[PDB]
């Protein structure tokens, strides 16, 4: 007697349609206000697919309210009318396009994170995805005679649950490409989590995304599996399936990728704070040449990585550059990655205002002596200033305790009192996580992890990477490269609304 | 009352953090320097690149456009204000001359004519060079703080300079002595700009406060309780009734030079507003921040 006989069906259709429409409207209104342009436009396309699904839900609600209690007489008319397969095409298009865009976005994140593509390629793949959605949603519609109104099988007009000509298509779209899409999403986030750990909020966020995807699409896989296994499921069950669990993406993707991310809160806080023709063609040719030149220049500039060098005058600042010159400026290559380490120290000792011009630098390598205790206090002061600086609050600092041998024989000699310059060493015990280094006295370990301790206590009062180095070991370049890879990981996660 | 001007053009050519810019004399052909060691000439009206000079230093700190428009200056920590000639008979732009006579970073070096250029260095000095000889024609000392900015008077007979000494002093181009000493600031000075009349100059420090000094001497101040963040670049309009300061609130703040009120806020930038510029005719405002965008405001 009614298309949605149960009152629960009607009330939640209206609720979920309103939620989907409002979320996608908010995403459209808020996305241009917030890193990466291609990711933003892909989010816009996903929002467009979600609001198309919301429009489908709204039009199904409107058709249901059009015939309330008289749906029995008009049942076969809507069975044969073009409106039913039209809205079925629209729903299938929305679901398929949203799924494909999600896979594209997640694969882009995977290829940027696990292995650390241009505006034209982004437009090409996005338009190709939309056209693929149109073709998939319209091939049953184009061959109307052969497909025997494929979309209009059930009264909901979304053909989830008829003869061979329909079931093959149904299992080709849902069991065929949607399950593979699920595999891609779950494998991609598993690989991202494994690469990040090998902090805690990232795992929680990934769990929420995969849980939303599962709760929306693994029941679809289940019901398609039972339908293909000749297990009887009446059409009212797939009516609830379309009504409740299918629009989950259309409700949650607008609030997940956009509303629950940190840059959304940053934008909210920002808003709160605020509240003849030959000459033209020659110029066009020059613009094309300059644009390809800047394409090559952008590839080159992102290929290299800046590495600021800092420390004390007595510190081993210059010997670090001198050591990897054997391996101001110095360009080197580690694992086919180009690094740009420079030690600007020929200027005055004043450094408050020329240090502001190194904020795109991947890492500030604070290498400082471990032996001179007055210079150790100076290092504590400089590290405090670096950590608490506004523009260095987003820059990772690679802490290097150079001349560890100088400190080792200086405390073995016992000529100078550590307590006189730092009394806390009289009441300090070695950390439990101290690295096992045989052949050296516990006094050296105590003092060395002690100076690590005032460095790290100031740091905890971007991330700091403390290390011990000398002038003998040549492995420091590899450790700097690993730390740079980690910084790449964190800031790439920052660009993709995750961290 | 209110000045609500938006991003009329967006210049997305730059691919790194933009550090300095300078308008040309003909109110077009912006020079813009970025962290990729790139120095790009734009046509403001049609938004098209005509020259892309590869700089020696990626982290360039200052760029300048000559008044004649044939030469462009590049400067940074490398103690050189390199001069490049654009009009080449061979048809390809190439380096022309280098000026290496300092031990501190040239935070800003701006031209007077095709031959002589004044530089403000990081070793507490300024220098007028003549690029025909290559010798530092005149030296300027007397600042006990790291010099960060300088502004050139319209008649180019005086140039004012602001340092980390929290003081701003004039220097004569020829004689080379500081007549007037102004010390009314509170923290390090980061930008300075002559008033269009040439009888005054505004100066933006890191104390989240701008001060307009007049040479008849603290003369005027621009600050508020809500702003607690410094100033990066200060620029004046053609008539001088309007001022724009590149605060590090990730957006420009437009002040009134005479009323010291909140004329407006130019939002739209993601990072520190590195440099600001206003045309000779007062038509357009070019803003360069670290989002690699030249935002034009009209």
């Amino acid at each position: 007697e009614n298309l949605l006989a149960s009152i629960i069906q009607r009330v939640f259709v209206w609720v979920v349609s309103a939620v989907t429409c409002f979320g996608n409207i908010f995403v459209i209104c808020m996305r241009p206000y917030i890193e990466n342009k291609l990711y933003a436009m892909s989010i816009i396309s996903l929002c467009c697919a979600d609001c198309l699904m919301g429009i489908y839900l709204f039009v199904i609600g409107g058709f249901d309210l059009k015939f309330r209690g008289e749906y029995n007489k008009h049942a076969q008319l809507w069975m044969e009318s073009t409106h039913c397969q039209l809205v079925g095409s629209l729903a299938i298009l929305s679901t398929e396009v949203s799924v494909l865009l999600l896979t594209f976005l997640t694969l882009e994140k995977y290829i940027c994170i696990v292995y650390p593509p241009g505006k034209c390629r982004t437009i090409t793949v996005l338009i190709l995805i939309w056209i693929t959605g149109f073709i998939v949603a319209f091939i049953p519609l184009s061959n109307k005679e052969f497909f025997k109104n494929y979309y209009g099988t059930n009264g909901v007009c979304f053909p989830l649950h008829e003869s061979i000509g329909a079931q093959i298509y149904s299992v080709a779209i849902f069991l065929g490409i949607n399950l593979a899409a699920f595999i891609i999403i779950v494998f991609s986030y598993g690989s991202m989590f494994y690469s990040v750990h090998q902090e805690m909020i990232l795992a929680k966020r990934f769990f929420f995304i995969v849980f939303t995807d599962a709760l929306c699409w693994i029941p679809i896989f289940v019901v398609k599996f039972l339908s293909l296994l000749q297990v009887e499921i009446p059409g009212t069950i797939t009516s609830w399936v379309v009504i409740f669990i299918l629009p989950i993406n259309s409700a949650l993707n607008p609030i997940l990728y956009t509303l629950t991310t940190r840059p959304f809160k940053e934008m909210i806080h920002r808003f709160w704070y605020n509240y003849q023709r030959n000459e033209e063609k020659a110029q066009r040719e020059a613009n094309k040449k300059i644009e390809k030149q800047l394409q090559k220049d952008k590839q080159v500039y992102r290929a290299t990585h800046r590495l600021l060098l800092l420390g004390a005058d007595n510190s081993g600042k210059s010997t670090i550059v001198k050591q990897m010159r054997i391996y101001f400026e110095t360009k080197f290559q580690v694992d086919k990655v180009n690094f740009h380490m420079f030690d600007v120290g020929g200027q005055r000792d004043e450094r408050r205002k020329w240090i502001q011009c190194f904020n795109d630098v991947t890492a500030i390598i604070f290498v400082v002596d471990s032996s001179d205790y007055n210079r150790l206090q100076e290092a504590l002061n400089l590290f405090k200033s670096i950590w608490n600086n506004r523009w260095l609050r987003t820059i990772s600092v690679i802490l290097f305790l150079n001349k560890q041998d100088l400190l080792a024989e200086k405390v073995l000699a016992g000529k100078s009192k550590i307590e006189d310059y730092f009394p806390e060493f009289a009441r300090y015990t070695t950390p439990e996580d101290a690295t096992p280094e045989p052949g050296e006295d516990p006094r050296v370990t105590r003092a060395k992890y002690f100076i690590r301790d005032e460095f790290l206590r100031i740091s905890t009062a971007h991330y700091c990477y403390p290390h011990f180095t000398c002038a003998v070991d040549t492995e420091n370049a590899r450790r700097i490269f690993n730390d740079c890879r980690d910084i790449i990981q964190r800031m790439h996660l920052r660009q993709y609304e995750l961290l | 009352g209110r000045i609500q001007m938006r991003t009329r053009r967006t210049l997305r050519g730059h691919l790194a953090k933009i550090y300095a810019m300078h308008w040309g004399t003909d109110s077009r052909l912006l020079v813009s320097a970025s962290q990729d060691g790139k120095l790009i000439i734009w046509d403001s009206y049609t938004t098209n690149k005509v020259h892309a000079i590869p700089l020696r230093s990626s982290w360039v700190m200052t760029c300048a456009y000559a008044p004649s428009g044939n030469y462009v200056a590049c400067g940074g920590l490398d103690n050189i204000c390199s001069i490049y000639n654009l009009k080449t008979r061979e048809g390809n732009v190439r380096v022309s001359r280098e000026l290496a006579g300092h031990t501190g970073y040239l935070s800003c070096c701006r031209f007077l004519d095709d031959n002589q250029i004044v530089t403000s260095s990081g070793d507490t000095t300024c220098a007028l060079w003549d690029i025909e000889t290559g010798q530092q024609t005149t030296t300027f000392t007397g600042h006990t703080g790291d010099v960060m900015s300088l502004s050139l008077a319209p008649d180019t007979r005086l140039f004012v300079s602001g340092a980390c000494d929290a003081s701003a002093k004039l220097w004569d181009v020829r004689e080379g002595m500081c007549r007037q000493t102004f010390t009314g600031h509170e923290s390090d000075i980061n930008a300075i700009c002559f008033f269009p009349n040439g009888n005054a100059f505004a100066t933006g420090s890191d104390d989240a406060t701008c001060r307009l000094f007049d040479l008849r001497a603290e003369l005027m101040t621009y600050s508020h309780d809500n702003i607690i963040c410094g100033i990066t670049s200060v620029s004046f309009s053609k008539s001088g009734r309007l001022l724009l300061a590149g605060y590090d609130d990730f957006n420009c703040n437009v002040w009134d030079a005479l009323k010291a009120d909140r004329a407006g806020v130019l939002a739209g930038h993601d990072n520190r507003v590195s440099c600001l510029g206003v045309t000779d005719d007062g038509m357009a405002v070019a803003t360069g921040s670290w989002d690699s965008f030249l935002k034009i405001w009209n």
């Epitope: 005055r348 000792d349 004043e350 450094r351 408050r352 100076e378 002061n381 400089l382 405090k384 200033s385 670096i386 608490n388 600086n389 506004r390 260095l392 | 507490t124 006990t144 703080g145 790291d146 980390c164 000494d165 929290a166 003081s167 509170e186 923290s187 390090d188 890191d206 104390d207 989240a208 607690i228 963040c229 410094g230």
Partner: nanobody, 126 residues
Framework: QVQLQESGGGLVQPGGSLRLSCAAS????????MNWVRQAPGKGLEWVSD????????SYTGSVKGRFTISRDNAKNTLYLQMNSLKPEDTAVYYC?????????????????????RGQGTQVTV
Amino acid sequence: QVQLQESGGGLVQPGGSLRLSCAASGFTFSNYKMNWVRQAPGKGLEWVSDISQSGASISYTGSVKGRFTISRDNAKNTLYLQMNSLKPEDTAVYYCARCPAPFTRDCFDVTSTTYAYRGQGTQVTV
């Protein structure tokens, strides 16, 4: 004109007491984290004490932690260093340092020279 004036001094027997007053003129004392520095003969500059804007966070160098302490008289816009039982080896000129930027904690006050935010200082002979 940023002015820092050091008051209080005189030769003190080892283990004695004294007061050091850093008076700030031309700027607000509250917004800036402050430091006490001292230059010994034959030695470079070294700031020995730092105190935050509201006085909540106070840190001392090891030669200062157990001997003598610092305080802010923000109403009098001045810094008190309460010299108490100083070792005889620390005969030095006591400079006062204001951090370069307001509303922040980054400070570079150990410049060899040309740091505009340090007073002439007074010579304490202990």
